[PDB]
Design a protein around this ligand. Structure first.
Ligand SMILES: CCCCCCCC/C=C\CCCCCCCC(=O)O[C@@H](COC(=O)CCCCCCCCCCCCCCCCC)COP(=O)(O)OCCN
Ligand SMILES: *[C@@H]1O[C@H](CO)[C@@H](O[C@@H]2O[C@H](CO)[C@@H](O[C@@H]3O[C@H](CO)[C@@H](O)[C@H](O)[C@@H]3O)[C@H](O)[C@H]2NC(C)=O)[C@H](O)[C@H]1NC(C)=O
Ligand SMILES: *[C@@H]1O[C@H](CO)[C@@H](O[C@@H]2O[C@H](CO)[C@@H](O)[C@H](O)[C@H]2NC(C)=O)[C@H](O)[C@H]1NC(C)=O
Ligand SMILES: *[C@@H]1O[C@H](CO)[C@@H](O[C@@H]2O[C@H](CO)[C@@H](O)[C@H](O)[C@H]2NC(C)=O)[C@H](O)[C@H]1NC(C)=O
Ligand SMILES: CC(C)CCC[C@@H](C)[C@H]1CC[C@H]2[C@@H]3CC=C4C[C@@H](O)CC[C@]4(C)[C@H]3CC[C@]12C
Ligand SMILES: CC(C)CCC[C@@H](C)[C@H]1CC[C@H]2[C@@H]3CC=C4C[C@@H](O)CC[C@]4(C)[C@H]3CC[C@]12C
Length: 405
């Protein structure tokens, strides 16, 4: 999300709260700037740790004024916290009481810790309340800085994973270009679209890495990035699905390229991409407009129908091909169908494990590996793409996979 916040104090109830996972030994900086001052101020701040992620997930600021009393009777959730309050006559716009040269304030759950600092990597909730007693007047700048500049926890492993994915996709592109350049006398039209898929994946990974680098080094995310990356990912997935469907039917490999075969049938699968547009951009930009179930159900049903169609077409194509005594293409089709069935089994196992580990627990006691659900799918897609690349590689006699009328 963000690490730098600018807030006009005379707005609402003057409560500013945020809950997120933070590193150990991270500092929180508060600055105040604005017009000349004439009103008494009273600033109170709470910084609370979290035993499990649940209280950071269902934390709604709209009732935060109630939440404090839940933290006042010692009847809330377990976790140590620090509190402090200070009074200022007019504005105190040049003192650094919240910056340095403070004291050692004990935490309640004999601590003697630094005033405003994290003591262990964990989910933290920070709340600040300003009371003004005798139309913007001030401006509050809030920053968080740990061992890195602005890269909080839960984003470091994702950034490393995206870097590794960028390197892997660059290697894939280099290998494909080398193989293509080595054998250019006779290629296939199916061997040109795999380069397009690799290019789209490379662009998506580069966009993600650039966005993460900018958010780390500036503290503010780029608005038109995540949406573009999601759109590119959806386009790449739709292209891969349609290529697999067209290969499964034997269009151009077993049977001749009939006039209306892909027309009105294969192209109509492009609406799947539309559904892929309703779950990517919608999920990346938090809306919560009662569309999560509508974003997950039809995509799963469409994918199941596509898998059913692909398997039936593959069975029919293999049955037809075995009757004419063909051995070169039969082994390739058997390897292709084995890879597809293994991918389906791995995907179903992954989805069962993800649904049985994360969204079944009362509160997530293991929040460290909370990023795996956003990377296992990409890793599986990359592995399947590499296997398909190894299966369909240009060679000396690159014509065994032709129709040959
Ligand atoms: C004996 C009973 C009769 C059996 C007859 C056979 C009927 C079929 C039976 C069972 C089918 C079981 C289907 C289970 C549902 C599928 C999983 C699911 O829910 O679909 C899921 C999982 O999707 C997958 O990850 C894999 C789905 C399988 C796709 C396999 C083919 C394409 C793989 C990509 C390869 C590209 C390589 C292209 C190279 C060029 C090639 C020429 C949808 O997430 P998603 O992904 O959208 O993104 C999630 C983002 N959060
Ligand atoms: C604004 O707030 C401050 C504290 O929040 C008020 O306290 C005054 O702060 C000054 C700054 O050190 C103290 O020193 C005085 O400064 C004036 C101007 O530089 C100087 O002429 C005096 O000889 C003295 O050194 C001052 O003692 C302190 N006053 C009190 C009663 O504690 C400040 O008064 C507020 N400003 C206004 C205009 O109300
Ligand atoms: C916590 O982080 C701080 C800052 O990253 C470090 O404490 C010292 O910070 C100053 C900078 O003002 C450095 O010059 C010192 O080298 C840092 N270490 C010490 C021992 O002074 C340090 O990384 C961490 N400090 C503790 C006590 O864990
Ligand atoms: C500044 O605001 C805090 C609230 O964050 C005030 O703390 C209250 O103090 C009164 C009397 O001391 C009691 O009701 C409680 O101790 C506090 N109430 C809470 C925490 O809800 C503090 O008194 C304020 N400073 C003033 C008025 O000078
Ligand atoms: C295409 C396939 C083969 C690529 C596989 C890349 C693997 C090796 C990458 C992807 C994600 C990576 C992990 C991402 C995050 C972390 C946390 C860090 O504190 C230690 C390293 C560790 C645990 C990484 C180790 C290497 C890792 C597992
Ligand atoms: C989402 C929408 C806009 C995509 C529409 C593009 C269509 C026309 C593309 C996408 C995939 C393409 C197919 C990919 C693979 C092959 C194999 C080759 O041996 C003959 C051409 C053929 C069969 C292509 C024909 C055109 C095709 C069907």
């Amino acid at each position: 999300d963000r690490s730098k916040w600018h807030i006009p104090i005379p707005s609402g109830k003057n409560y500013f709260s945020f809950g997120k996972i933070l590193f150990r030994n991270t500092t929180i900086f508060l600055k105040f700037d604005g017009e000349p001052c004439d009103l008494s101020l009273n600033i109170t701040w709470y910084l609370k740790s979290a035993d499990c992620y649940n209280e950071i997930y269902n934390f709604k600021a709209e009732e935060v004024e109630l939440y404090l009393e839940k933290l006042k009777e010692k009847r809330g959730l377990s976790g140590k916290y620090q509190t402090s309050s200070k009074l200022f006559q007019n504005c105190s716009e040049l003192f650094k009481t919240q910056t340095f040269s403070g004291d050692f304030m004990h935490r309640l759950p004999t601590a003697m810790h630094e005033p405003l600092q994290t003591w262990q990597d964990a989910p933290y909730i920070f709340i600040v309340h300003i009371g003004i007693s005798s139309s913007n007047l001030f401006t509050m700048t809030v920053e968080v800085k740990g061992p890195y500049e602005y890269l909080t926890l839960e984003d470091y492993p994702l950034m490393i994973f995206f870097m590794v994915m960028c390197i892997v996709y660059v290697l894939f592109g280099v290998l494909w270009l080398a193989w293509s350049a080595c054998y250019w006398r006779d290629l296939l039209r199916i061997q040109f679209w795999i380069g397009a898929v690799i290019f789209l994946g490379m662009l998506e990974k580069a966009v993600f890495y650039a966005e993460f680098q900018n958010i780390r080094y500036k503290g503010e995310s780029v608005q038109g990035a995540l949406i573009l990356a999601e759109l590119l990912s959806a386009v790449k997935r739709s292209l891969a699905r349609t290529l697999v469907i067209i290969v499964s039917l034997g269009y151009g490999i077993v049977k001749p390229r009939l006039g209306v075969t892909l027309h009105k049938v294969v192209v109509a699968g492009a609406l799947y991409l539309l559904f892929s547009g309703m779950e990517g951009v919608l999920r990346v930009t938090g809306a919560q407009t009662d569309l999560a179930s509508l974003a997950f159900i039809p995509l799963a049903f469409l994918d199941t129908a596509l898998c059913w169609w692909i398997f039936i077409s593959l069975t029919q194509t293999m049955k037809l091909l075995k009757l004419r005594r063909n051995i070169v293409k039969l082994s390739l089709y058997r390897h292709f169908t084995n890879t597809l069935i293994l991918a389906v089994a791995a995907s179903i196992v992954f989805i069962i494990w993800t649904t049985m580990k994360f969204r079944i627990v009362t509160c997530q006691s293991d929040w460290r590996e909370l990023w795996v659900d956003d990377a296992i799918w990409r890793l599986l897609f990359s592995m399947i793409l590499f296997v398909i690349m190894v299966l369909w590689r240009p060679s000396a006699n690159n014509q065994r996979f032709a129709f040959s009328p």
